[PDB]
Write a structure and sequence with these properties.
By secondary structure, the chain is mainly α. The protein folds into two domains: 1-200, Growth Hormone, Chain: A (Up-down Bundle), CATH 1.20.1250; 202-375, Growth Hormone, Chain: A, CATH 1.20.1250. It has 13 helices and two strands, in the order αααααββαααααααα. The protein has helices spanning 3-15, 19-32, 41-51, 54-65, 72-91, 106-126, 138-159, 172-196, 207-235, 240-263, 269-291, 302-330, 335-361; strands at residues 96-99, 102-105. The chain has a two-stranded antiparallel sheet with strand order 1-2. A hairpin with a 2-residue loop joins β1 and β2. The longest helix has 29 residues, at 207-235. The radius of gyration is 21 Å and the shape is globular. The protein binds riboflavin (RBF) (2 copies). Residues 29, 39, 42, 162, 232, 368, 371 line the site of one riboflavin. It holds the Pfam family SLC52_ribofla_tr. InterPro entries: Riboflavin_transptr. It is a multi-pass membrane protein. Its main location: membrane.
Length: 375
């Protein structure tokens, strides 16, 4: 009866989805300076988030053994897991211990693994719950899910991450406590959304429903496995302004794509194929730039900064739009159709991360750049 309030509440509910991982990733530079691992930490966090897909195996087993039980119990378990994990991370992130003879960060990595589990279960737990609503709220859900990534980047901007050795404006404790506040707000918004709602076969093997799952898997394998790995190697040779602009504008291109989808939405499979193609084009240009990390073409000229920022903006916006559109097309099916859309996203992301591990952590194909020097 009150559509704007429902839009706001579903937006906040969706915002509290992937905030912990998207905050850890942006905070990595402040933490790296103290931990004994060094700059090998982004390859540990990646493997942890890839292994976190065991939350699906637990959600499925609980949905099997308890067949007709309630549907809001996994949502609340995931929310409490996230809140308590972020509090414990804010409290005990700097404890090291000798494992295998080497000093290692056990508390940081264990809590990152728990948060990855919660965030991976959040998909197959939160997304199918929107079958109780008209399809115009999937777009608000995804807009909030994009704000989930946009807000920590602004927080790291205010903190002063990446200023080059200056001392930030506040330590990592304040950052993780702000993340805890975000997660509590999301839990309260979902509790209100529960008060707002009234008291209570041939498709899976079709070609039209496989053409959408393949698109979801491929676009998510690109956006969630490869770009987080080649980001710095692509953007760093062009300075500190290029890197900051690329990061912030790529993070802000998701909510704007979801707003544009709120405006007009595509519904033909061929249009989504074309959009995915023009996104893969830029996604491949970025990696072709990252392979030549020492000296890419057009370095030190104002053309390269623009040509490397616009690629990130275009890629992330196009893929977010295709995700929103394909998910809204599969909503006609039910909770079963929506459940299929989360599993595909997660399988694609897992395949992307597993495929990106060997070029990055085994053979070292990309070569880093020494600061204040032009090789
Ligand atoms: C290392 C890493 C792995 C991620 N994996 C996923 C993922 O599997 N699925 C997902 O929806 N988002 C994942 N994200 C976040 C994804 O970009 C997220 O949808 C947007 O950040 C906010 O929606 C990941 C983010 C990072 C930094
Ligand atoms: C795997 C890896 C990731 C890196 N990530 C960043 C980064 O995110 N931001 C950055 O400024 N430098 C990054 N660097 C470069 C790092 O800052 C560089 O080694 C030091 O500046 C050299 O003193 C990275 C280097 C490596 C090897």
């Amino acid at each position: 009866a009150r559509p704007v309030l429902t839009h706001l509440l579903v937006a906040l509910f969706g915002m509290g989805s992937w905030a912990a991982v998207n905050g850890i990733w942006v905070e990595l530079p402040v933490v790296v300076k103290e931990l004994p691992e060094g700059w090998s930490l982004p390859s540990y966090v990646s493997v942890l988030v890839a292994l976190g897909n065991l939350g699906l195996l637990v959600v499925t087993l609980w949905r099997r053994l308890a067949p007709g039980k309630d549907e809001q119990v996994p949502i609340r378990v995931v929310q409490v897991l996230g809140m308590v994990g972020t509090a414990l991370l804010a409290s005990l992130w700097h404890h090291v211990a000798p494992v295998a003879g080497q000093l290692h960060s056990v508390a940081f990595l264990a809590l990152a693994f728990v948060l990855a589990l919660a965030c991976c279960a959040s998909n197959v737990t939160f997304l199918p719950f929107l079958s109780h609503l008209p399809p115009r709220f999937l777009r608000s859900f995804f807009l909030g899910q994009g704000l989930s990534a946009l807000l920590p980047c602004v927080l790291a901007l205010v903190q002063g991450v990446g200023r080059l050795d200056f001392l930030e404006r506040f330590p990592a404790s304040t950052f993780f406590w702000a993340l805890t506040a975000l997660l509590v707000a999301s839990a309260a918004a979902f509790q209100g959304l529960l008060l707002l709602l009234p008291p209570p076969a041939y498709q899976l093997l079709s070609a039209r429903s496989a053409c959408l799952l393949g698109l979801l898997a491929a676009t998510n394998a690109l956006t969630n496995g490869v770009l987080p790995a080649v980001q710095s190697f692509s953007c760093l040779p062009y300075g500190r302004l290029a890197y900051h602009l690329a990061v912030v504008l790529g993070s802000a291109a998701n909510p704007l794509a979801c707003f544009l989808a709120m405006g007009v939405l595509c519904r033909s499979l061929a249009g989504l194929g074309g959009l995915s193609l023009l996104g893969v084009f830029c996604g491949g240009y970025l990696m072709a730039l990252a392979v030549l990390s020492p000296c890419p073409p057009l370095v030190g000229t104002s053309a390269g900064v623009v040509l490397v920022v616009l690629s990130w903006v275009l890629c992330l916006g196009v893929f977010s739009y295709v995700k929103v559109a394909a998910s809204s097309l599969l909503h006609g099916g039910g909770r079963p159709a929506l459940l299929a859309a989360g599993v595909a996203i997660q399988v694609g992301s897992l395949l992307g991360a597993v495929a990106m591990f060997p070029p990055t952590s085994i053979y070292h194909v990309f070569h880093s750049r020494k600061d204040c020097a032009d090789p």
